[PDB]
Amino acid sequence: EPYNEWTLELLEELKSEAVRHFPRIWLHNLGQHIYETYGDTWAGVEAIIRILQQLLFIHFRIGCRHSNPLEFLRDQPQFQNMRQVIQQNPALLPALLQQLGQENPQLLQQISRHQEQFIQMLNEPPIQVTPQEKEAIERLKALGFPESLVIQAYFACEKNENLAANFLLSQNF
């Protein structure tokens, strides 16, 4: 049961990278909403770890305004390539991250569960919705954001249409 004490040992590191690439405001809400959803229960802080990672991935595509089943990634061109472009212009991610999941679906599933470890290298030397929730997702799109960028955020903010709003406007830029 590491999620108890351990989660604090790893999390602290997960925030160091996220909190640094994440908007203070959002980080203030995510913990506020996610705190009111589950409450004080440990499940809340537990979902914050997973929601934090999946969020980092987006921070890449959107554009970083700042500055192991994945370790083998180095054996892939997309890494050395996407990393050569992404680091130069994360704006080329949306199109890349797509070609990555279309070619290597096994890795795409990992890179998502290993953002930090996936970023450090990328920053250093080498659905489930319905007609009731949907209307809530696209609601953020009209804000001037891709249709997919919403499906992710919405689910990234715990389906919190109130949170995503800030997550979209606080996603850099």
Binding site for Zn ion (CB under 5 A): 21, 64, 66
Name the residue nearer to Zn ion (CB basis): 24 or 66: 66
Name the residue nearer to Zn ion (CB basis): 45 or 85: 85
In terms of Cβ atoms closer than 10 Å to its own Cβ (0-12, 13-18, 19+), residue 66 is exposed
- The least distance separating Zn ion from the CB of residue 83, rounded to whole angstroms, comes to 15
DSSP state of 71: G
In 87-160, which residue ranges form alpha helices assigned H by DSSP? 93-103, 105-111, 115-123, 131-141, 147-156
Half-sphere exposure of 131 (CA within 13 A, CB side): 0
- The least distance separating Zn ion from the CB of residue 51, rounded to whole angstroms, comes to 17
- The least distance separating Zn ion from the CB of residue 146, rounded to whole angstroms, comes to 19
Find how far residue 28's CA is from the centre of its chain.
16
Rounded-to-10 torsion of CA 146, 151, 152, 157: 120
Contact indicator for 73, 107 with CB cutoff of 8 Å: yes
Name the residue nearer to Zn ion (CB basis): 21 or 83: 21
Indicate the helix (H) or strand (E) that contains 16: helix 2-21
Residues 79 and 121: their CA atoms lie apart, in Å, by 9
- The least distance separating Zn ion from the CB of residue 47, rounded to whole angstroms, comes to 22
Name the residue nearer to Zn ion (CB basis): 17 or 155: 17
Name the residue nearer to Zn ion (CB basis): 21 or 114: 21
Name the residue nearer to Zn ion (CB basis): 55 or 137: 55
- The least distance separating Zn ion from the CB of residue 130, rounded to whole angstroms, comes to 33
- The least distance separating Zn ion from the CB of residue 172, rounded to whole angstroms, comes to 7
